[PDB]
Coordinates of C-alpha atoms and ligand atoms in Angstrom, one line a residue:
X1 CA 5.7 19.8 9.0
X2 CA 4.5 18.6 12.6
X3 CA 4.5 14.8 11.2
X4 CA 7.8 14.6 9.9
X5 CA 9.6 12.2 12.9
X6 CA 6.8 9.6 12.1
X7 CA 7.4 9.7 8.7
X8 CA 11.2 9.2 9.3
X9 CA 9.8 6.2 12.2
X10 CA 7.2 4.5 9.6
X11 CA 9.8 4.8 6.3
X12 CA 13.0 3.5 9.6
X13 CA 10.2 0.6 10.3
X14 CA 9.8 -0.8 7.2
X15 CA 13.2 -0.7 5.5
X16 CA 14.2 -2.3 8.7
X17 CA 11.6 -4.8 8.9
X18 CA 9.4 -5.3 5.7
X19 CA 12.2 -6.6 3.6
X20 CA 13.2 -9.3 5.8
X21 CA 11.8 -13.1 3.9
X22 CA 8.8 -14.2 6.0
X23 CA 9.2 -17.4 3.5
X24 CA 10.9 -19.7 6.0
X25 CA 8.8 -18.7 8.9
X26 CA 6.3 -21.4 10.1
X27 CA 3.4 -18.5 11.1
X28 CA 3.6 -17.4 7.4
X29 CA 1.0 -18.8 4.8
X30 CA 1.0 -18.4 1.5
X31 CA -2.3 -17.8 0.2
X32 CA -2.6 -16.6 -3.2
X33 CA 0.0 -17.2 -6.1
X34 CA -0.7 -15.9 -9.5
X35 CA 2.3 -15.1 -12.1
X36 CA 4.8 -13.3 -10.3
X37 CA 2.6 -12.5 -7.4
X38 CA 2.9 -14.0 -3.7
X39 CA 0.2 -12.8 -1.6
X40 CA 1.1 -13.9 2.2
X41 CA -0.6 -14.2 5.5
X42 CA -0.1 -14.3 8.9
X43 CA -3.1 -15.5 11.0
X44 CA -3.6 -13.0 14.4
X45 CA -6.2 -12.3 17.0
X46 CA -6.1 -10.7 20.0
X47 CA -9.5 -9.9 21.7
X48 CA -11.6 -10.4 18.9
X49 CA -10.0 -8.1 16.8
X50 CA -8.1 -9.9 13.6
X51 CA -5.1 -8.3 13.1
X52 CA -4.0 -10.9 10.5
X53 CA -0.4 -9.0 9.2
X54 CA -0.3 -9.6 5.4
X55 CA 2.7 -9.3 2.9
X56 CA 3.3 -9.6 -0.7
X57 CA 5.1 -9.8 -3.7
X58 CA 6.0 -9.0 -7.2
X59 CA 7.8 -8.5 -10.7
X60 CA 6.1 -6.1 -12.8
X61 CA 8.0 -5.9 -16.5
X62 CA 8.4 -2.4 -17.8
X63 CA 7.7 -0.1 -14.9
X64 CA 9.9 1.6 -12.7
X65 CA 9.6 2.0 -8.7
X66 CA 9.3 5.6 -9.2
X67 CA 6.5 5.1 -11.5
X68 CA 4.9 2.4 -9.3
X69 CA 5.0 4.7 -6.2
X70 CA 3.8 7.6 -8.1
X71 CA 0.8 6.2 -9.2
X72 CA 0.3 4.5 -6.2
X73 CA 0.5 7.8 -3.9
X74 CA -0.7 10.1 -6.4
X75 CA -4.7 11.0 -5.7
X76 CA -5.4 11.8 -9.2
X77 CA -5.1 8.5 -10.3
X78 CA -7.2 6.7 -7.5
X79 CA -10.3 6.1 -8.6
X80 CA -8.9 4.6 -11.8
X81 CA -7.7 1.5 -9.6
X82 CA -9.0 1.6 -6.5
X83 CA -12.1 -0.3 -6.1
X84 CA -12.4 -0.6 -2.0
X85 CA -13.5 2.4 -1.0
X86 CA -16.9 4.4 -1.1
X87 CA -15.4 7.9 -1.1
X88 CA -12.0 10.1 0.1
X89 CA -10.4 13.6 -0.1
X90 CA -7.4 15.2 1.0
X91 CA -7.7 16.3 4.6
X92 CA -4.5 18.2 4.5
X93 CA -1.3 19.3 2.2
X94 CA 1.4 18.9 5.0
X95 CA 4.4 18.7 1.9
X96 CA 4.9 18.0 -1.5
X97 CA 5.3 14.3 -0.8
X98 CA 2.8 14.3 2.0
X99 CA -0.7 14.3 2.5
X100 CA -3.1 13.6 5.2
X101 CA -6.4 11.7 3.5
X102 CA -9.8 10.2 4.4
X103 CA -12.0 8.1 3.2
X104 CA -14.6 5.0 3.8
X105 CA -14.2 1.1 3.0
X106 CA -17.4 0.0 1.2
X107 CA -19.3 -2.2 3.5
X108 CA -18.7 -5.9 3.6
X109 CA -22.2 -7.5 5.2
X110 CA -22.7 -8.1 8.0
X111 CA -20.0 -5.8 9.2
X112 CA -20.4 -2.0 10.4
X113 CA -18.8 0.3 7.8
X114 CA -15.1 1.3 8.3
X115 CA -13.9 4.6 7.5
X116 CA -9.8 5.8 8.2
X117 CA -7.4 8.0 8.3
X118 CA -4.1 8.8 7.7
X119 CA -0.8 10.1 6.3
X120 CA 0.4 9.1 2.8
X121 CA 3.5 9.7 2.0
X122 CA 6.1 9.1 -0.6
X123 CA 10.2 8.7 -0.4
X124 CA 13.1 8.0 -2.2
X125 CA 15.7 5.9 -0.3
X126 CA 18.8 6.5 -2.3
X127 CA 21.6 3.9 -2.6
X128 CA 25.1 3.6 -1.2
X129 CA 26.2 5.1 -4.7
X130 CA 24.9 6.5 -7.9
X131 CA 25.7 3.0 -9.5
X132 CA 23.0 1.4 -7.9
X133 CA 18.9 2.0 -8.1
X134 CA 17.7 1.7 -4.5
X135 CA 14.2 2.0 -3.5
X136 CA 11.1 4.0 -3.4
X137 CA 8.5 3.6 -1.0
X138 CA 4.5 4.9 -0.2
X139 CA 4.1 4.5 3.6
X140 CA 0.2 5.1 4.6
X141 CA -0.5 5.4 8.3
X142 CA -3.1 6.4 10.6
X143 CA -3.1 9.9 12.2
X144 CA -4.9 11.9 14.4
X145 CA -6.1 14.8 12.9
X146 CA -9.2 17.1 14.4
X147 CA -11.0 17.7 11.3
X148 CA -11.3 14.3 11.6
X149 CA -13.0 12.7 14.4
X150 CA -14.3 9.4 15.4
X151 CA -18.1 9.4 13.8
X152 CA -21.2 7.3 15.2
X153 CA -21.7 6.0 11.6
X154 CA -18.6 4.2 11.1
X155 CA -16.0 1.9 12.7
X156 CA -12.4 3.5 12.6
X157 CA -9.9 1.2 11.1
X158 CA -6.1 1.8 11.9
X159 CA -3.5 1.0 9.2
X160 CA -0.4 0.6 8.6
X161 CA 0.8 -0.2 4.8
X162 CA 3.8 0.3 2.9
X163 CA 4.1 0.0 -0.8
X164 CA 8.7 -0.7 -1.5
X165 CA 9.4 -0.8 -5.0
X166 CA 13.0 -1.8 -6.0
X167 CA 14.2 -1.9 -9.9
X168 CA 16.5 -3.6 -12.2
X169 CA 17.2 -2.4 -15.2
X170 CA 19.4 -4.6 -17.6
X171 CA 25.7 -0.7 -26.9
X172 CA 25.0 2.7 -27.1
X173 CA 21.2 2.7 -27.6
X174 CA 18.3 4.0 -25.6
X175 CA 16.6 1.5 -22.6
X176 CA 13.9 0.1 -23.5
X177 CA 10.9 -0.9 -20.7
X178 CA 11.5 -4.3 -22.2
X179 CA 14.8 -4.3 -20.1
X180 CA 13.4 -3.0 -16.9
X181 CA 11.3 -5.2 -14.3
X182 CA 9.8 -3.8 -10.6
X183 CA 10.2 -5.8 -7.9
X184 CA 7.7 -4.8 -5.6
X185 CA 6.7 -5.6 -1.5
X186 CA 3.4 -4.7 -0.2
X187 CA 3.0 -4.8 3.7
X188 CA -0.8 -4.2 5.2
X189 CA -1.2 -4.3 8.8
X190 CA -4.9 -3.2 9.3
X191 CA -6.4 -3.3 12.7
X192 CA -10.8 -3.0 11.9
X193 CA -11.4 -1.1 15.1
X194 CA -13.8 -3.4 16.5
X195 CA -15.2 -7.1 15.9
X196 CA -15.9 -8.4 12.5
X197 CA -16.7 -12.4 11.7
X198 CA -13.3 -13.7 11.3
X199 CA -14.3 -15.8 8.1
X200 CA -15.8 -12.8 6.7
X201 CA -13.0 -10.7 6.8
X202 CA -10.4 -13.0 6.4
X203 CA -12.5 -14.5 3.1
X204 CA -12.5 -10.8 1.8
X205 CA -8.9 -9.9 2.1
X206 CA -8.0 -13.1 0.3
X207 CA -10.1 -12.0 -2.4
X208 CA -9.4 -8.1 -2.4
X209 CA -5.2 -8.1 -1.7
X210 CA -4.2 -9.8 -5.0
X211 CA -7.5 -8.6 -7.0
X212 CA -6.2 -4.8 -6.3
X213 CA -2.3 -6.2 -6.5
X214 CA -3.4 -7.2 -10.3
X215 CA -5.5 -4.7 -11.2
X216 CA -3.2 -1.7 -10.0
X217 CA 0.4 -3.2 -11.7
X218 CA -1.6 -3.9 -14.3
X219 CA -2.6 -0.5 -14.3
X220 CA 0.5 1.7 -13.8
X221 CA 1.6 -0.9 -16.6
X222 CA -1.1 0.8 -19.1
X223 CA -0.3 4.2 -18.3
X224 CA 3.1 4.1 -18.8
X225 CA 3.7 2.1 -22.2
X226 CA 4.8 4.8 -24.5
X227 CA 5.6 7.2 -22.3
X228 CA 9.0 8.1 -21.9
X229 CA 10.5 6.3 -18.3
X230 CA 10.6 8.0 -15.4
X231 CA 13.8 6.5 -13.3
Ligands
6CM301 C1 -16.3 -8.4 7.3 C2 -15.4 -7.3 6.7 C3 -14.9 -6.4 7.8 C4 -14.1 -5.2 7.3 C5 -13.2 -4.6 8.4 C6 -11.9 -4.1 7.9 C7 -12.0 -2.9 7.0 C8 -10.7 -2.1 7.1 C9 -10.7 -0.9 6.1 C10 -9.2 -0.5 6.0 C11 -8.6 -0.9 4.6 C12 -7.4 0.0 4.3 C13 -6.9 -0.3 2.9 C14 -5.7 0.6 2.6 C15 -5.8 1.5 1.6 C16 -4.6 2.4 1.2 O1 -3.4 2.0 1.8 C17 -4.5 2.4 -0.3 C18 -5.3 3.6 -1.0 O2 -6.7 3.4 -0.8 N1 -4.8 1.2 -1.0 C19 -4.2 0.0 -0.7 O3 -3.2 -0.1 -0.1 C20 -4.8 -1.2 -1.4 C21 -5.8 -1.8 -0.3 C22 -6.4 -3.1 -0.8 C23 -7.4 -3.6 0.2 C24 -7.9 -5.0 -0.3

């Protein structure tokens, strides 16, 4: 499909960058800690637009990163964990892994209403050998796409997020999810598309990041037990 050099850019970008420990960097914050999850922030603004670059992480038990990204990317599943948005629908099928979705943010007073758009797409980055798990990843990104224009009712936000999921797994007998933990690190880089109070928003994403980070392990968690595991 027409999109797949950005893919290879965006899935390039974040392997290269994503990864790298923001922990001894002075611009980094640590805003929310809970468990096993680190919910980080960079504070940015450039014209009055807050950019603020957020990263986290975490160590789900008993899920793998092929499960984690699955549910993440998979559209069926949404609504079950997402709790942001007002509505969205598949814009476009471009591949099996890669789809091309809209939707709106519910409104956060006093701010205009963002909607966005872009391409979600999921990948498996194999190891240097079969020995070794290597990662999956969900890279969302805006696009351009015409059936999708900029609308006088909302403000288009630009993204870029990344969902890398890495696992470890550790007789003769069958693995149990007991033995198998997901590390997980989620980048967001969202630009609003126009002013919002910087309070506001920033207030909101410290609230919203780790409430969805919780509720969606927590989720994929649920679904899984029982089932048989999905390396
Ligand atoms: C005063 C408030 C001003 C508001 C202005 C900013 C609004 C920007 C809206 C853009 C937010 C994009 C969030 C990313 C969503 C997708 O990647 C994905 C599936 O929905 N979910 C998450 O990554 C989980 C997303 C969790 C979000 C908390």
């Amino acid at each position: 499909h027409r999109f797949v050099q950005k893919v290879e850019e965006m899935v390039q970008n974040h392997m290269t960058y994503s990864l790298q420990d923001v922990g001894g960097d002075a611009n980094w914050q640590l805003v929310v800690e809970e468990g096993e999850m680190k919910v980080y922030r960079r504070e940015v603004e450039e014209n009055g637009i807050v950019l603020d670059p957020l990263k986290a992480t975490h160590a789900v038990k008993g899920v793998t990163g092929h499960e984690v990204c699955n549910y993440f990317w998979n559209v069926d599943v949404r609504n079950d964990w997402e709790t942001t948005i007002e509505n969205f629908h598949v814009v476009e099928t471009l591949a099996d892994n890669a789809i091309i979705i809209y939707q709106t943010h519910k409104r956060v007073w006093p701010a205009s209403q963002r909607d966005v758009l872009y391409l979600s797409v999921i990948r498996k980055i194999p190891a240097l050998t079969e020995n070794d798990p290597e990662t999956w990843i969900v890279c969302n990104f805006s696009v351009d796409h015409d059936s999708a224009p900029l609308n006088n009712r909302c403000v288009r936000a630009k993204i870029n997020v990344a969902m890398i999921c890495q696992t470890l797994v550790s007789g003769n007998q069958e693995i149990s999810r007991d033995n198998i933990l997901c590390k997980i690190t989620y980048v967001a880089n969202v630009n609003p598309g126009g002013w919002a109070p910087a309070s506001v928003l920033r207030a909101v994403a410290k609230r919203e990041y780790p409430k969805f980070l919780k509720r969606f392990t927590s989720y994929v968690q649920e679904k899984t037990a029982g089932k048989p595991i999905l390396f």
